[PDB]
Structure formats: structure tokens, C-alpha cells
Ligand binder design. Structure first.
Ligand SMILES: C[C@@H](N)C(=O)Nc1nc2c(s1)CCCC2=O
Length: 130
């Protein structure tokens, strides 16, 4: 209905704002764009489902997220991909892992503090009805 499309539009506005706040944080610059296979040839082979904050924005605008949980699955994927691609004890690996965990924690904390539980429940019930 018109009421339901208003609800999903509010969700998209909220997700764009959260994603923007993540993307402008200097700690998360390595997660803002897709991995250029020129610079990192082994990435496209080791990571089967790449995800980054620019791809998240595109999915928002394609109406791919109908719930905050759908969004957080892609935030979680950015994080899990980084942990999988950076398993070594080397400080370059440890730095990216730390930033990945901070990206995930930051997104979850913003959503916990700023997204009303009843709004997320409404999104889920509209989604489960389709
Ligand atoms: C130092 C070495 N471990 C390194 O540069 N690792 C990198 N990891 C990632 C890069 S570079 C960009 C895409 C996301 C990602 O997980």
C-alpha cells in the first residue's frame, strides 16, 4: 500500500544516513569501494561474495533492503570478508581486522541507539506478508 511504501522509504533514508556516517569515517576508508583487481589480484578469488559501503548504497537505492536485518547482513559480510582475507598475525592484517570489527560494532551501536524497535518490527511484518 501507500502506507507500506512510506515505511520502506523511511527505512531507506535511515540506512543511507547510517551508511554515510560509516563511509566518512577515516578508519573505514578501506571498506568504501570495491576491490580493484589490478591492485589486489588474489582478492576476487579468495572472497566469493565481496561487499563494500558503495555497494550497500547501491542496494539501498535498488530497494534491496526491506528490513534493518537485511542491511546488517551485508554489514556483517563486509566484516567477515575482511577477517577471512586477513587471517595472519602480521600488523597489516591485524589493522584491517580491527577496523572491520569496529565498522560492525559502530553500525550495530548506531542502530541500537537510533532505530525504534517498533519501526523495525513493522518492516519485518510487511516483509513477511509479501
Ligand atoms: C596488509 C594486507 N593484509 C592488506 O592490505 N589486506 C587488505 N584487506 C582488505 C583490503 S587490503 C582492502 C579490501 C578489504 C580488505 O579486507
Amino acid at each position: 500500500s501507500m502506507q507500506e511504501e512510506d515505511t520502506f522509504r523511511e527505512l531507506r533514508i535511515f540506512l543511507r544516513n547510517v551508511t554515510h556516517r560509516l563511509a566518512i569515517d577515516k578508519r573505514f576508508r578501506v571498506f568504501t569501494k570495491p576491490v580493484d583487481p589490478d591492485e589486489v589480484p588474489d582478492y576476487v578469488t579468495v572472497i566469493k561474495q565481496p561487499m563494500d559501503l558503495s555497494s550497500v548504497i547501491s542496494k539501498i537505492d535498488l530497494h534491496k533492503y526491506l528490513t534493518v536485518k537485511d542491511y546488517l547482513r551485508d554489514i556483517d559480510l563486509i566484516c567477515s570478508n575482511a577477517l577471512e582475507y586477513n587471517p595472519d598475525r602480521d600488523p597489516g592484517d591485524r589493522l584491517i581486522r580491527h577496523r572491520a570489527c569496529a565498522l560492525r560494532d559502530t553500525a550495530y551501536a548506531i542502530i541500537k541507539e537510533e532505530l525504534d524497535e517498533d519501526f523495525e518490527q513493522l518492516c519485518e511484518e510487511i516483509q513477511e506478508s509479501r
